[PDB]
Amino acid sequence: KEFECGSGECILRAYVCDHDNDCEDNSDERNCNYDTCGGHQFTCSNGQCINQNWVCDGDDDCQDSGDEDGCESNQSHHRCYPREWACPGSGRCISIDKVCDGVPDCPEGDDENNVTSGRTCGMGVCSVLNCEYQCHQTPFGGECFCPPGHIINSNDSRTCIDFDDCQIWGICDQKCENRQGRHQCLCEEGYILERGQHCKSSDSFSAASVIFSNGRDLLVGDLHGRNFRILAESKNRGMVMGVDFHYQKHRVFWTDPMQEKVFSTDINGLNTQEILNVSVDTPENLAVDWINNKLYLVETKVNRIDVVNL
Amino acid sequence: TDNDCSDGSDEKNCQASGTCQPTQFRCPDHRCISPLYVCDGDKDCADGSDEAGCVLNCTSAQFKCADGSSCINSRYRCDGVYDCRDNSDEAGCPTRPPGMCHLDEFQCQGDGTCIPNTWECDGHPDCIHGSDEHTGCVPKT
Amino acid sequence: EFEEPRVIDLWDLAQSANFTEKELESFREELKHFEAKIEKHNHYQKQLEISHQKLKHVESIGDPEHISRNKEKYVLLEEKTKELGYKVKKHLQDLSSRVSRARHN
Amino acid sequence: VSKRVYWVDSRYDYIETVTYDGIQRKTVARGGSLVPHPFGISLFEEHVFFTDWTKMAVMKASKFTETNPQVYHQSSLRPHGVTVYHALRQPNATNPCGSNNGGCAQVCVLSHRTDNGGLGYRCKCEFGFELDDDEHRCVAVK
Ligand SMILES: *[C@@H]1O[C@H](CO)[C@@H](O[C@@H]2O[C@H](CO)[C@@H](O[C@@H]3O[C@H](CO[C@H]4O[C@H](CO)[C@@H](O)[C@H](O)[C@@H]4O)[C@@H](O)[C@H](O[C@H]4O[C@H](CO)[C@@H](O)[C@H](O)[C@@H]4O)[C@@H]3O)[C@H](O)[C@H]2NC(C)=O)[C@H](O)[C@H]1NC(C)=O
Ligand SMILES: *[C@@H]1O[C@H](CO)[C@@H](O)[C@H](O[C@@H]2O[C@H](CO)[C@@H](O)[C@H](O)[C@H]2NC(C)=O)[C@H]1NC(C)=O
Ligand SMILES: *[C@@H]1O[C@H](CO)[C@@H](O)[C@H](O)[C@H]1NC(C)=O
Ligand SMILES: *[C@@H]1O[C@H](CO)[C@@H](O)[C@H](O)[C@H]1NC(C)=O
Ligand SMILES: *[C@H]1O[C@H](CO)[C@H](O)[C@H](O)[C@H]1NC(C)=O
Ligand SMILES: *[C@H]1O[C@H](CO)[C@H](O)[C@H](O)[C@H]1NC(C)=O
Ligand SMILES: *[C@H]1O[C@H](CO)[C@H](O)[C@H](O)[C@H]1NC(C)=O
Ligand SMILES: *[C@H]1O[C@H](CO)[C@H](O)[C@H](O)[C@H]1NC(C)=O
Ligand SMILES: [Ca+2]
Ligand SMILES: [Ca+2]
Ligand SMILES: [Ca+2]
Ligand SMILES: [Ca+2]
Ligand SMILES: [Ca+2]
Ligand SMILES: [Ca+2]
Numbered sequence: 065k066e067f068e069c070g071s072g073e074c075i076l077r078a079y080v081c082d083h084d085n086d087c088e089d090n091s092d093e094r095n096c097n098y099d100t101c102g103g104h105q106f107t108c109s110n111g112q113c114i115n116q117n118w119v120c121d122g123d124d125d126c127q128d129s130g131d132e133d134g135c136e137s138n139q140s141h142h143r144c145y146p147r148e149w150a151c152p153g154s155g156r157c158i159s160i161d162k163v164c165d166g167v168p169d170c171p172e173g174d175d176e177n178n179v180t181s182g183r184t185c186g187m188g189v190c191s192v193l194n195c196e197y198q199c200h201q202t203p204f205g206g207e208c209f210c211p212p213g214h215i216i217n218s219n220d221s222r223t224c225i226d227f228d229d230c231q232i233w234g235i236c237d238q239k240c241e242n243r244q245g246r247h248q249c250l251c252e253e254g255y256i257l258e259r260g261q262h263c264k265s266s267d268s269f270s271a272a273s274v275i276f277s278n279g280r281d282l283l284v285g286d287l288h289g290r291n292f293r294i295l296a297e298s299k300n301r302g303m304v305m306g307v308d309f310h311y312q313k314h315r316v317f318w319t320d321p322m323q324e325k326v327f328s329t330d331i332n333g334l335n336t337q338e339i340l341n342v343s344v345d346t347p348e349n350l351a352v353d354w355i356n357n358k359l360y361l362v363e364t365k366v367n368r369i370d371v372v373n374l
Numbered sequence: 375t376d377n378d379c380s381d382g383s384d385e386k387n388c389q390a391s392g393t394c395q396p397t398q399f400r401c402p403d404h405r406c407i408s409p410l411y412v413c414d415g416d417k418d419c420a421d422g423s424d425e426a427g428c429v430l431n432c433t434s435a436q437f438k439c440a441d442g443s444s445c446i447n448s449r450y451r452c453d454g455v456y457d458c459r460d461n462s463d464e465a466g467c468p469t470r471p472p473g474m475c476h477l478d479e480f481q482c483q484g485d486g487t488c489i490p491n492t493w494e495c496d497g498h499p500d501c502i503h504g505s506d507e508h509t510g511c512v513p514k515t
Numbered sequence: 516e517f518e519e520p521r522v523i524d525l526w527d528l529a530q531s532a533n534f535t536e537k538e539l540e541s542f543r544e545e546l547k548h549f550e551a552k553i554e555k556h557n558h559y560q561k562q563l564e565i566s567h568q569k570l571k572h573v574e575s576i577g578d579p580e581h582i583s584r585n586k587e588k589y590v591l592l593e594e595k596t597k598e599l600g601y602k603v604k605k606h607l608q609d610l611s612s613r614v615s616r617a618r619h620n
Numbered sequence: 621v622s623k624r625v626y627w628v629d630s631r632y633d634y635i636e637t638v639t640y641d642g643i644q645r646k647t648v649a650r651g652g653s654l655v656p657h658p659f660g661i662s663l664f665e666e667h668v669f670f671t672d673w674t675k676m677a678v679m680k681a682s683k684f685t686e687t688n689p690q691v692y693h694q695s696s697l698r699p700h701g702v703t704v705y706h707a708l709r710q711p712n713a714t715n716p717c718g719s720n721n722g723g724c725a726q727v728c729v730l731s732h733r734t735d736n737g738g739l740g741y742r743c744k745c746e747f748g749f750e751l752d753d754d755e756h757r758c759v760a761v762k
């Protein structure tokens with residue numbers, strides 16, 4: 065009768081596959097699948113969908129605490145990454161290659177000798193602590209450490225435990241990948257791994273250039289900052305405020321709040337034309353929708369976000 | 375950290391190594407600020423050190439809300455708008471006694487309408503049945 | 516299509532709120548999930564005192580194995596009731612607050 | 621490609637990053653001595669390029685952690701805007717509105733790919749008209 069559970073129980077029909085452990089043997093949701101989340105919802109390890117608004121509301125809504133994973137930064141729960149150590153004076157962690165290298169690396173000098181507080185970069189602790197892999201000097205004494213792939217166990221500070229170095233901030237230009245091996249990166253289509261870590265752009269694309277407003281006029285320059293070309297000079301005491309570009313049509317769009325107009329030009333110059341000249345009294349910013357060829361703009365005289373064709 | 379000079383002169387050489395001027399407050403590893411921004415009402419500091427735990431000194435020209443959150447101008451006390459968050463500025467305000475008018479005002483005999491005292495005996499019948507221009511009104515020349 | 520006293524008022528308050536037809540249509544499909552959480556919580560609320568009496572009866576019997584086995588099931592059953600208690604309260608607060616804000620102007 | 625959003629602050633003087641859902645907040649630069657008044661920002665490969673009204677220059681910083689942002693074209697005015705122009709900065713995808721304007725009478729505007737039952741677009745109406753019951757035909761507002 066009803067849904068016979070994995071261990072013989074009359075579980076209700078609605079209970080199976082509702083993102084929850086209902087069966088006594090944890091087998092009430094194995095045989096089905098669950099639909100994915102709409103863009104107005106967010107994910108959990110339960111296969112569940114939760115409201116966008118619940119994320120970082122402070123509530124453990126989905127068992128992982130996953131919708132509350134680090135809603136805050138520069139904070140007390142450091143639990144610092146492999147080959148790192150914390151100077152007691154502040155909420156700061158510094159790599160072992162810096163800690164007690166002879167130069168103050170924590171700004172307060174909390175990683176070098178401080179005789180006034182009776183602290184020296186000692187190494188005697190390793191003799192009795194008997195580190196598993198290696199030891200290093202700290203103001204406390206000889207601190208035990210273990211190789212990349214692993215962190216010092218917090219129970220004893222003498223053992224070391226397997227780790228997900230994919231967590232280090234600055235690991236990769238996209239993702240960690242080639243995992244089960246400790247860590248390196250992988251880069252998406254159109255990128256190549258120069259040096260390791262670096263997702264360098266493919267040679268098949270034109271040279272990257274930065275276009276920007278120097279305050280009055282639109283300028284163009286390469287990534288190395290060796291060349292600077294004026295793309296378009298402002299007329300009638302104008303001011304280039306917000307710039308954006310469309311690649312496929314090779315056009316550059318910018319706004320002029322002093323002239324209260326929006327302009328568009330070709331990347332090499334010429335074909336300069338006004339795009340909007342009514343109710344555009346203060347076009348604070350700009351963004352093009354290259355897939356649908358739309359121009360999202362921000363207006364601040366009457367606070368709104370408008371959409372127009374290119 | 376603000377370009378008040380419009381040339382960036384005032385913010386030049388302002389490294390983290392240094393102190394605030396004697397007449398400035400310090401935000402923890404963020405910026406120095408005018409003491410005018412200390413207890414201005416809003417947090418200028420990254421961690422709100424400028425607004426931390428200080429108390430209001432609302433003046434006689436101002437009224438302090440019951441919740442003690444903020445002070446408002448004396449003009450806004452008893453006006454018919456809830457300027458305070460807890461509606462304390464409109465709590466305990468005067469009213470007309472039932473069916474009657476303030477010691478100030480004049481009352482229309484026709485329908486009990488309260489009108490300004492000056493509108494009794496000013497030549498114009500400001501009342502529905504001319505109560506405010508009765509025979510006892512001494513005329514003006 | 517509602518039975519819970521809590522959900523019935525929320526739907527009545529929803530029809531007088533600022534909800535767009537699309538928002539109101541999606542609101543009903545959320546109340547259906549909200550009711551399922553309540554009925555699941557209500558079902559386990561009966562089970563908590565049912566097993567509580569079962570645990571009390573077994574503790575009177577005095578068998579250490581039956582007492583240990585029933586206690587192991589009981590403390591896990593209590594967690595099931597307690598965790599659903601907040602699941603229902605959090606959903607109730609969000610639904611009540613949203614319709615409160617949509618009616619407040 | 622990382623599904624992250626970078627924003628800058630002119631008042632608390634930081635550059636920070638969160639995922640598209642707001643989780644996993646991290647700081648890439650902060651303090652009045654580093655980012656006194658950032659206004660515009662853009663990024664390419666491993667670098668973030670931002671303009672600042674106080675140093676009056678476009679800056680280069682690492683997208684992860686920058687101890688001291690390098691200068692780039694120091695200017696005599698407030699630099700108001702910056703963006704990197706490259707092909708990989710505009711990835712390549714199929715627009716739902718490409719199919720005969722998505723059947724919309726006047727305007728076809730994108731949405732989230734799951735929205736509108738997986739169509740990923742909604743029809744919009746110009747100022748002089750309103751959207752009808754079928755959410756496809758535009759009729760004059762009354
Ligand atoms: C989104 O989709 C579009 C369309 O498919 C892609 O656009 C293509 O991008 C590739 C990559 O750069 C282009 O390939 C290059 O084409 C050049 C010539 O094409 C231009 O000129 C012809 C006319 O002569 C036009 O028909 C064409 O539309 C282009 O305007 C070649 O010169 C390039 O090769 C050169 O460099 C390589 C080294 O990199 C050398 O080995 C070669 O010998 C040669 O010197 C190259 O083949 C392609 O042309 C683009 N097509 C269009 C229509 O734009 C977007 O890139 C894509 N975006 C992404 C990132 O997905
Ligand atoms: C706005 O810009 C469009 C071009 O995209 C332009 O056609 C509009 O009208 C033009 O305005 C000019 C300046 O007022 C005017 O000299 C010109 O004759 C006129 N062109 C036509 C045929 O309409 C622009 N509008 C405004 C008011 O600037
Ligand atoms: C030791 O540390 C591990 C984490 O590495 C922790 O799970 C465990 O509870 C600790 N205690 C013992 C003695 O295992
Ligand atoms: C103003 O209010 C403060 C509140 O801290 C109080 O200490 C002080 O005596 C008052 N008088 C003045 C004008 O300082
Ligand atoms: C998952 O389900 C959602 C429901 O809104 C969408 O249909 C989405 O498109 C599905 N996922 C994929 C990968 O198609
Ligand atoms: C702190 O720095 C300020 C910067 O205006 C002055 O140089 C001041 O003399 C300094 N005070 C001390 C004690 O170093
Ligand atoms: C208003 O003031 C009168 C005195 O003129 C009375 O105190 C009256 O009770 C007040 N109104 C209310 C609502 O209490
Ligand atoms: C009218 O007012 C004038 C003002 O100059 C004189 O006071 C005059 O005597 C008044 N008339 C009467 C009848 O009192
Ligand atoms: Ca289940
Ligand atoms: Ca939450
Ligand atoms: Ca050091
Ligand atoms: Ca302040
Ligand atoms: Ca008032
Ligand atoms: Ca009168």
Ligand SMILES: [Ca+2]
Nearest residue numbers: 375630631656
């Ligand atoms: Ca500032």
